[PDB]
């Protein structure tokens, strides 16, 4: 068990991509989040999972309890605006009748699940029915109006034409279905970020069973942390079953060196913000949820 | 005549006391069982609130039977506004209802068994104790209640204060997987409740063959006609209920009138008999003044001008002409209701369409018309009445089973040795928070 | 070590809090077998008067115009090492905030307050209904706090700290908590946990942000409790796998 | 004596508070003529930066994600002898409690707090809109507090005390005040004043007791303020005929 | 100006009754509250007044803005349950267009008006438009359910038959239209009283312009305090105009001696209650609005 | 572009002027433009206000009904309403379903006038740019909402 001060607690870290070519056709990166949930369903580690499905406006996610391989695949690809994944957490155990709930989401959503497991506050039956969590890396998120403003104004693209969006190499990238590419400098996006992201002290989904993301791995690949006993059992079985190609992370460039550095910048910048809240006023401060 | 008082009662829900006039032998001549639970006042605070909120507040009258108030309140709103809910909403409400009856009757087994004897012996059940046969009985009861709460949670959204019911039907239908899960659990439960039922009936039959029971180290004789009264019974359905939307409602609001305790309860008395050995902590001190008319916290609903008995025996007497009365007859009738709950769930699941609609397409807002709904709660007829206008509750009234049973059980106390007055009370499975609301 | 002594005290409650405790099933029997003696509970046992307790689980609020109730809640503080406000009525008033008198046969029974306005409260268990698992965790951790090795008592004190902070924060609970102390504070991040915890479906998310039907809300305080931006105690919550295994072992046969 | 110096500071407000001050008509002109100099008010005058003030009338709440706003409200505390939260937004957040971001062209402008959560507030003038007469009484009494004989300064301090207690009580306002702190406290006596003060008709009386449409309430704090069982300071209010004549003489030509 | 510690501030106290024989036919006592408001309207001191009109259930009062002599007379007779008079105070100056508002009510309602005049909190235009207040003596009040319980149970009368109710000589009295009389000992009524009356420190409507009540005067007569300059101007004119018979109070039995004693018992009993609130809990107390 | 707090509504793809001059130009073909013309048009609106009040009072039935007998709850259909606020056309648009607002939008006069007044600044000495602004009678809390 490595206990990293910026990458959290984990057993191993590899670079990986799914061997399911259908999944990879529309996965954001390696298809880890989709492949892990499909496999968990077909093997019976879960009987349903919360995923960011398609919503009612283009590129606006809608949380949904998926119970088939087909419904899980609809959630492929990154939506860079808020998806309130945890709103279906209790309901998954009520009208859906699930015994083994999967949850996907970003770092704060992993935190929400773990708080619910230890301090269930009107969350009956949830502690014991959470079966598997896959956490995405997340530097920051946006309101939907923020995302519209970035894509339509700054990138000058129509949302109905966008095939993929990607934050990497210092730019917000927009790919269209007809084959065009537009970029926006990340400096331009800063005003649009969701303010509650600025106290977040968690980059690589420290509290998930398995965490997955893009940084540290070449395109089409994911950096994966296997963290908990649940996470290790499922990953071992999946690898043994042929579900994934892997490479130890230290044989991969830029790997864990860059990743640990981006995690450190996030925590340091946001810890400072948390500190300034304390003296925000005159002889008064703002609340610290971590106090 | 002397006056003895037990305050508080125990092994029942909520806060009441027994203020008893007894003859020279300690036999009750006239006893009053009365609520001393504070009046939270749900009927008055309801006025002006939304028809969506009032049922969820009324649920919090009681955590054992919240299904009863959630459904009776919602269906009173639906009856006042003229809203007909979809079939699959009704099926889910019935599954919720039957499941809760299982959990409640099984909880009451825990409350009453410490008064009962391991058959053919002089040992009373102590269900806390990690010894047989109590522990295997506790294990069965505990699995029964767990199954029941689980089904309630799946069909009703929450086992305590169900969230799925709403004006017009339900928030959610259930998945194919949930429907299978409820069937699997009901199959398991049916075998268990048949066993628990036979066990309880054997224990009660043994009680009926006893001549005395032990209270505080003394032998207390068991009257043959323990708990007999002449008030008769009232019931609206063997399982679910009835509402003013029905072609032929099975409850008659022109036969009901509610008085204050005044008309039916004793006035001021002074306790002059005290037993400090009554388990565990004794009875009210000599010299205490009591006044049931003024201390009683409930109203007194009547039917044809008289208190009536409600609950499982009332239902079996009304719908099958069950013909035994009193304390042990009440206990018998309650256990006999176990299997109907599981067969009903399974039949409802068999008819449930998991793709079917669960919310009426149109929800009218009401013009001030009166509607009412009866739910046959585990303890008896729970009748909510309402006038909804423009989506707000303009008038609200609640006639709750234990409210009805308070004056009736009081009258059934005559003839009991005061030391087992509490056994007469417990056969009513009292919910004093319900009775008071 | 001995079993700690536990009572259930019933003020103006619905007994749904007690039912929640009981819905731990063989978990409760295990706790009563090995860690705690139930010394008082009118619903389950015949002890008529409030005895001394290590832990008093107090459900319901206090009707100010009911003398015996006021005496009961003062007697309870006097008799108890640790007072737990069990459930949202005891913590925050909940549906009895709306009580306003006028109903037979005590039209003067008008005013209800959470217990913390009459006595000092050590620990909140919020919820309507409260989660069985939470009541169980608190009972186990209270045992460890009183009878464990100093490694356990250190864990127990760290586990309970946010439930003790809630008791010091105040006696009010409402949808508006999420406005006042989360959204209006710059802490909301749109996870939607509040919407899952709400027992009456009063909370929706619109563009990732809480929307409250205040005339449906029954003022239970659940949503602020469950929100991961009310209290998030990293020292405990990041050790979730460990604390889970510890609690489970304490319940194992 | 000199005129005191008064500024109007405008945070996230609607200017209805300023309009209320102006709706004292020749009363305001009389105060500006004889008792006070308006040293700062962007709506009425060209002083661009916050100067020193004896009394700052601050309207609106503070958007935490607007840097200049945060600086303005801190600069105001630094520059002012007496800070008055003028109106329900400044006192209690009011409609900006419901702000949750997401609108063009600043979707990150999400979090608003009453000024008392960022600086110390000496005096509350609650109301949405605040009553012109109240703003006038407070300005007159603040003048007497600073420039009067010690008999006047004693009256002024006693007049303002309940508005200073409100500022120390907290920064929240809602229908539920009347439940929490009046009905639930055993103090409601059914006078119905709350129903008259409510600006949106959210309060009815049912059998003599307040009934609140919480999804109509805009959280202004008016009804608790006006209730004669929030604060009732007998030393002032029983002298109503006298204090009325005193205020009137101070405005007479 | 007498400054009495239990009877408040006043200029004189007389025993009086209206000379209007129509008013007296249904007045509770001397007809002072009705006669003063009718006279104020016809003379133009007020253009409307808040009175306890007839409501929707028998003997349940409903506040109303009366603007005619006929509407004022409908409010005659004591309703011993809550009438929220002040709920129409602001509206009287809005849609009713009144410049000179009269208010009738009991002591706490007089207090509400004076608080509104000095601390208007969302009560614009009310301070300067309150023109005349007449305050009733009041020992305590009841919810409507309390009143039903007292009359129907304790007195055994039908509300639809009651002509007058009266608390006097230690008993709650019920008079029926067909000529019967029933009484209830006041001891029996104590549980029913409105709890908020138990912190009330004001018996003879200390803060009204004119205060009027029954105690101290024979049947059909009222004890009247003239307190403010408004009150003295109107009363002087009304007496000069023939509207009232008077007797100095000290020539009247039982007079001010009994009245000052009942006021003292009220204040002392309720001041004690206010004091006990402070230590009501353990190391905690309840709020004191007077603190 | 980034500091501006408003949206920019357009009509036929361009900013427009709203307010008293816009009303007099649309409905009487008032034919003067610019700062002093805006000021003139605003003062000219004073008497209509008083004649309108008096005519409305003359027609008002003080016993007449003031609430529709039936208030439907909505099916999600879009409706809109324009009020000619003192500063110009104030247009609110809404979809109500089951008594709840499902969609809401506000095009407020000063919102419209912000880009238009900007363009009117060309040619002014910068020291009286503020005089150009004030002829629009700006309400910046309105424009932003
Ligand atoms: C706001 C956001 C910020 C991110 N920032 C980074 C970063 O800084 N560095 C980095 O390496 N990776 C970041 N990621 C993760 C990365 O973009 C991919 O989502 C991740 O690598 C998983 O890709 P995949 O091929 O395994 O998943 P896929 O197979 O394509 O499946 C997509 C998964 O992502 C979930 N998901 C998609 N959108 C959301 C959403 N809005 N909210 C919650 N869950 C969602 C889906 O439920 C599904 O589980 C971010 C993701 C999000 C939503
Ligand atoms: C709860 C209550 C308690 C009282 N207790 C006493 C007492 O202890 N000692 C004593 O001497 N007098 C008491 N009174 C006053 C007395 O009963 C008469 O109301 C008073 O003498 C005025 O009578 P009148 O002939 O001048 O008025 P009338 O001409 O008969 O006119 C009646 C007036 O009383 C007002 N009024 C009637 N009911 C109410 C009500 N519920 N709430 C507010 N205003 C109302 C009406 O608006 C009207 O102004 C009490 C009155 C009330 C409402
Ligand atoms: N069963 C039941 Fe309740 Ni707790 C009762 N009595 C009611 O409806
Ligand atoms: N006039 C005006 Fe407002 Ni304060 C503007 N602009 C709007 O509708
Ligand atoms: S930066 Fe943190 S708070 Fe914001 S969406 Fe990502 S994991 Fe959540
Ligand atoms: S918190 Fe909820 S379940 Fe607990 S006593 Fe109160 S109403 Fe019942
Ligand atoms: S649970 Fe908390 S952080 Fe998450 S959406 Fe609700 S208020 Fe915002
Ligand atoms: S919104 Fe829901 S969870 Fe939050 S306090 Fe209200 S009823 Fe409780
Ligand atoms: S308190 Fe009301 S009138 Fe004053 S700034 Fe706020 S919205 Fe405007
Ligand atoms: S103003 Fe105060 S005392 Fe009067 S009715 Fe309203 S809450 Fe009760
Ligand atoms: S109920 Fe009315 S007066 Fe009271 S806080 Fe709400 S809007 Fe303001
Ligand atoms: S006793 Fe006091 S609080 Fe009660 S109704 Fe009379 S004047 Fe009002
Ligand atoms: S305080 Fe929330 S209505
Ligand atoms: Fe009832
Ligand atoms: Fe807009």
Numbering used by the authors:
A (entry chain B), E (entry chain B): 1 to 291
B (entry chain A): 2 to 438
C (entry chain G), D (entry chain G): 18 to 270
F (entry chain A): 294 to 438
The study reports:
Here, we employ a bidirectional F420‐reducing [NiFe] hydrogenase from the archaeon Methanosarcina barkeri MS (MbFRH) as a unique model system to yield structural and spectroscopic insights into a scarcely explored reaction intermediate that is the initial target for H2 binding to the active site of the enzyme. Each asymmetric unit contains three subunits, FRH‐A, FRH‐B, and FRH‐G, and a total of four [4Fe4S] clusters as well as a flavin adenine dinucleotide (FAD) cofactor and the [NiFe] active site (detailed below). The FAD and the heterobimetallic [NiFe] center enable the redox conversion of the two substrates, coenzyme F420 and H2, respectively, while the [4Fe4S] clusters mediate intramolecular electron transfer (ET) between the two reaction sites. These features are shared with the related [NiFe] hydrogenase from Methanothermobacter marburgensis (Mm), and both enzymes exhibit a dodecameric overall architecture in a spherical shape.2 Compared to the latter enzyme, however, MbFRH contains two additional cofactors that are both ET‐accessible and solvent‐exposed: a [2Fe2S] cluster bridging two FRH‐G subunits and a mononuclear Fe site in FRH‐A.
While the presence or absence of bridging oxygen ligands can be clearly established from crystal‐structure analyses, H2‐derived (hydride) ligands are only observable in sub‐atomic‐resolution structures, and available crystal structures lacking detectable bridging ligands most likely represent hydride species.9e, 13 Since crystals of MbFRH have been prepared in a mildly reducing atmosphere containing up to 5 % H2, the derived structural data could reflect Nia‐S or a hydride species. IR spectra of MbFRH crystals reveal CO and CN stretching bands at 1945 and 2065/2080 cm−1, respectively, which resemble the IR fingerprint of the Nia‐S state of several [NiFe] hydrogenases.6a In particular, these vibrational frequencies are close to those observed for the as‐isolated regulatory hydrogenase from Ralstonia eutropha (ReRH), which is a spectroscopically valuable yet structurally unexplored reference system for the Nia‐S state. Specifically, a peculiar seesaw‐shaped geometry with trans S−Ni−S angles approaching 120° and 180° was postulated to be mandatory for thermodynamically favorable binding of H2 to Nia‐S.16 In line with this proposal, the [NiFe] active site of MbFRH exhibits trans S−Ni−S angles of 107° and 171°, thereby structurally confirming this unusual geometry of the Nia‐S state. Notably, four‐coordinate NiII sites, as found in Nia‐S, typically exhibit (distorted) square‐planar or tetrahedral coordination geometries.
